[PDB]
C-alpha cells in the first residue's frame, strides 16, 4: 500500500490537515493507511475514518443521483435518442462509488470489527457496515440486491442489539445508529411505518434520559435528536 512507509502518527496528523483543507479523498487515503497498520483505533481516530469516507461517498452519491435523473429522463416517451454516453458515465460514477464502499467494508472486515470489543467501538463499526451496504443497495438493480439489503439490515440490527443493552438512550452513537437505520427502513426496505416508529421511540426515550446529562452532553444528544424530529416531520 502506498501509505505503508509512513508512520501511523504522521498519517493521523495528515488526515487532520486534509480535513482542514477539505481534501476528503486524501483524508480517506491517510486513514486507510492508518487502519492498515493493524492497531485498533481510538474514538477520535474512528471519527476521522468515518468523516473521510462519508464525505467521499456523499459526493459520489450526489453525482450518481444527478446522472441517474438525466438517464431516467432520456428513457421517457418523446425523448430524443442521444446514444450510450449517459448510461456509460452513470456506470463510471457507480463503479467508483461501489469501489469506495468495498474499500470501507474491507477495512471493517479486515480487521476492525473482529477486534472491537467495547460497545462504543463495535456499535460504531457495525453502523458503518450498515451504512456502506445501504449505499451499495441504493445503486443495486441485479440478482444480489436482496442479499445486499439483507447485509445492511443484519449489520444495523447487531449494532442496535448491542446499543440497547450497553448504552444509555441519549448516547450519540446509539442515536446516530437509530437515525440511519430508520432511514434504511424508509428508503431501502420499503418499511415507512418501521422507520417512523423507530425514529419516534428513539426520540422519546432520549428525551426521558436528558435529565441525567451535563450541559455539554445535553448539547450533543439534542443535536442528533433534532435530526430524528426533522425526518419525522418529513415523513408525516
Amino acid at each position: 500500500g502506498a501509505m505503508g512507509s509512513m508512520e501511523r502518527a504522521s498519517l493521523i496528523q495528515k488526515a487532520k490537515l486534509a480535513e482542514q483543507a477539505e481534501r476528503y479523498e486524501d483524508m480517506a487515503a491517510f486513514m486507510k493507511g492508518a487502519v492498515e497498520k493493524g492497531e485498533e483505533l481510538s474514538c477520535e481516530e474512528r471519527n476521522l475514518l468515518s468523516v473521510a469516507y462519508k464525505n467521499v461517498v456523499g459526493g459520489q452519491r450526489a453525482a450518481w443521483r444527478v446522472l441517474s435523473s438525466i438517464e431516467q429522463k432520456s428513457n421517457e416517451e418523446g425523448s430524443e435518442e442521444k446514444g450510450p454516453e449517459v448510461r456509460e458515465y452513470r456506470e463510471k460514477v457507480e463503479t467508483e462509488l461501489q469501489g469506495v464502499c468495498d474499500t470501507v467494508l474491507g477495512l471493517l472486515d479486515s480487521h476492525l470489527i473482529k477486534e472491537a470489543g467495547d460497545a462504543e467501538s463495535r456499535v460504531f463499526y457495525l453502523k458503518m457496515k450498515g451504512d456502506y451496504y445501504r449505499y451499495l443497495a441504493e445503486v443495486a438493480t441485479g440478482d444480489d440486491k436482496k442479499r445486499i439489503i439483507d447485509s445492511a439490515r443484519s449489520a444495523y440490527q447487531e449494532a442496535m442489539d448491542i446499543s440497547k443493552k450497553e448504552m444509555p438512550p441519549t448516547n450519540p452513537i446509539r442515536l446516530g445508529l437509530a437515525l440511519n437505520f430508520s432511514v434504511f427502513h424508509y428508503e431501502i426496505a420499503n418499511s415507512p411505518e418501521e422507520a417512523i416508529s423507530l425514529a419516534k421511540t428513539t426520540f422519546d426515550e432520549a428525551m426521558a434520559d436528558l435529565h441525567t446529562l451535563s450541559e455539554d452532553s445535553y448539547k450533543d444528544s439534542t443535536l442528533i435528536m433534532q435530526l430524528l424530529r426533522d425526518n419525522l416531520t418529513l415523513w408525516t
Partner: peptide, 5 residues
C-alpha cells in the same frame, strides 16, 4: 433526502 450522520 432525509438526514443521516
Amino acid at each position: 433526502f432525509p438526514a443521516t450522520v
